[PDB]
Design a protein around this ligand. Structure first.
Ligand code: NI
Lengths: 214, 221
């Protein structure tokens, strides 16, 4: 109950109302998802960035990860279509932190993820505000655990952003997800993500390809 | 239900349509402000290219965003139906051409207001104004006449859209509308009033896909 909504391809819409150190911004994303194979394809675009796109990549539909014998362990699919609240605190080392609250749910043929991001204490002209991050993304494993207290899931992981000079900028993620309406065992999502661009696009944008499997 | 439009709320529209067999899908997204009567939307055909001119889909693609003056607040059938929502049904007769049949469910889905629509266009003449794409990319000013429908605890609407044609004439589209609430509606059925509609159609320069961007102001009277 909830698996049938991901029988094949589903249209996605992402919305992010964000500000970092005061500089408000807005990003919209559209595209499609196929939970059956674990593929995502999206075209993000800043309609208002004071911040590099890759720091926004984790926070921008985990429901689409390919779960193999683990179908009921899928908190993300089973909370559908009521949805879940995903809350995160992202601390970037020796630099600022983002706070995000997002509501992921279904709305017609569409699956939607509403985000409000607020970023604070960022060093001016550090790796993030000085834009020293490479326009790319690496592969990571996120560890999902069960949370009996609020009938949901906790997650812990660290993102390794590659920096233009050759060093690395770490981003500690702390995550909590709880359902909107009406527990899975310790498992992992391994993520692979490509960031690119479209040739004839003068607007600020991100082209995103993801493969995530449980 | 008024409290749901205290300020700006995000909108999503879903349109599944086929005209004379030609299937399409339009998704729209944007923002609405009932306090000023403003709508700002960017629609997009995800099925590729529309077999139909954009202006003919404009009345079909959220009247809950129309600005009622304070003294008519209880007369706003659309807002009082929230968040349960209402069903909107229309029959559109185009003079010298086909007819649209539409059914939509307008309701809330989280912080969002969503308009889910399924349209069927039929008996449209090959080489007419519509399938022949002779319609100007713009939109005129109209008044929709709303009456109370005691029969189904809802409202009827009557109006005609005046479509400008590329060569210099106008193409008429008689609209027939009936709205019924999903839950408890308004505490009273509204008296005869009209919405004055004003609409701008434009394009985004950077967008190579088939799209339209819409700006609307609707106020009651
Ligand atoms: Ni359909």
């Amino acid at each position: 109950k909830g698996e049938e909504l991901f029988t094949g391809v589903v249209p996605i819409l992402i919305e992010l109302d964000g500000d970092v150190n005061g500089h408000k911004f807005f990003v919209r994303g559209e595209g499609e998802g196929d939970a059956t194979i674990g593929k995502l394809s999206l075209k993000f675009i800043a309609t208002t960035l004071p911040v590099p796109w890759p720091t926004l990549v984790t926070t921008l539909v985990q429901a689409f990860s390919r779960y193999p014998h683990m179908k009921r362990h899928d908190f993300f699919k089973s909370a559908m279509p009521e949805g879940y609240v995903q809350e995160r605190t992202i601390y970037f080392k020796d630099d600022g932190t983002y706070k995000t609250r997002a509501e992921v749910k279904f709305c017609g043929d569409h699956l939607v993820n509403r985000i409000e991001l607020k970023g604070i204490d960022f060093k001016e002209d550090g790796n993030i505000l000085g834009h020293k991050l490479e326009y790319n993304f690496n592969s990571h494993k996120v560890y999902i655990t069960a949370d009996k207290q609020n009938n949901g899931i906790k997650a812990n992981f660290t993102i390794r952003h590659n920096v233009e000079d050759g060093s690395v900028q770490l981003a500690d993620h702390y995550q909590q997800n709880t359902p909107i309406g009406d527990l899975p065992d310790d498992h992992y999502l391994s993520t692979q993500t490509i960031l690119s661009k479209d040739l004839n696009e003068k607007r600020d944008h991100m082209v995103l390809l993801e493969y995530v499997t449980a």
